[PDB]
Structure 1
Amino acid sequence: MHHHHHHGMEEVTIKANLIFANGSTQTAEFKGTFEKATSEAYAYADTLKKDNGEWTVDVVPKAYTLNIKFAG
């Protein structure tokens, strides 16, 4: 499944792609912890439910940092 594994001091950027029933789209950016950034994106989507209907989301990571530590 789509599991978010929280890290302390995490800072991520979320690019939300809003796709409407008629094929038109809208994009917006959100920043902060994953929890904070996604909740703002979902709150935003909820403000559009009135005129655009129910929505579903797919979370797709695009960039990562790998911290590789050598013991010596």
Structure 2
Amino acid sequence: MHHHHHHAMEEVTIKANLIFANGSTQTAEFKGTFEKATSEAYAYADTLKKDNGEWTVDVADKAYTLNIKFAG
């Protein structure tokens, strides 16, 4: 499944690729928590439904931070 595991004070960058039925595309960037950032991307997509129809989305990861702590 596609699951975002929230962390406090997270800062995530969302690159949205909008692909229209005729093959044309548009890209936009959103930043903030994963929840807020994706919400804005979806809200934007919704403003385009009137002229471009229903949309579906696939979320794919691109970057992570690994915090590795040694005990000594």
Same fold (TM over 0.5): yes
Indicate the residue corresponding to 1:52 in structure 2. 52
Shift of 1:54: 0.4
Counterpart of 2:55 in 1: which secondary structure? Answer: coil
Unaligned runs of 5+ in 2: none
Counterpart of 1:23 in 2: which secondary structure? Answer: coil
Regions of 4+ moved over 6 Å:
none
What TM-score results when the alignment is normalised by the length of structure 1?
0.98
Shift of 1:50: 0.4
Counterpart of 2:64 in 1: which secondary structure? Answer: coil
Unaligned runs of 5+ in 1: none
Distance 2:28 2:65 in 1: 23
Q: How many residues align?
A: 72
Shift of 1:29: 0.2
Distance 1:46 1:70 in 2: 46
Query: More strand by proportion, 1 or 2?
Result: 2
Shift of 1:35: 0.2
Over aligned residue pairs, what C-alpha RMSD do you find?
0.4
Distance 2:10 2:61 in 1: 14
Shift of 1:16: 0.2
Q: State the percentage of identical aligned residues.
A: 96
Q: Deviations over 1:15-61 (max 9, x none)?
A: 00000000000000000000000000000000000000000000011
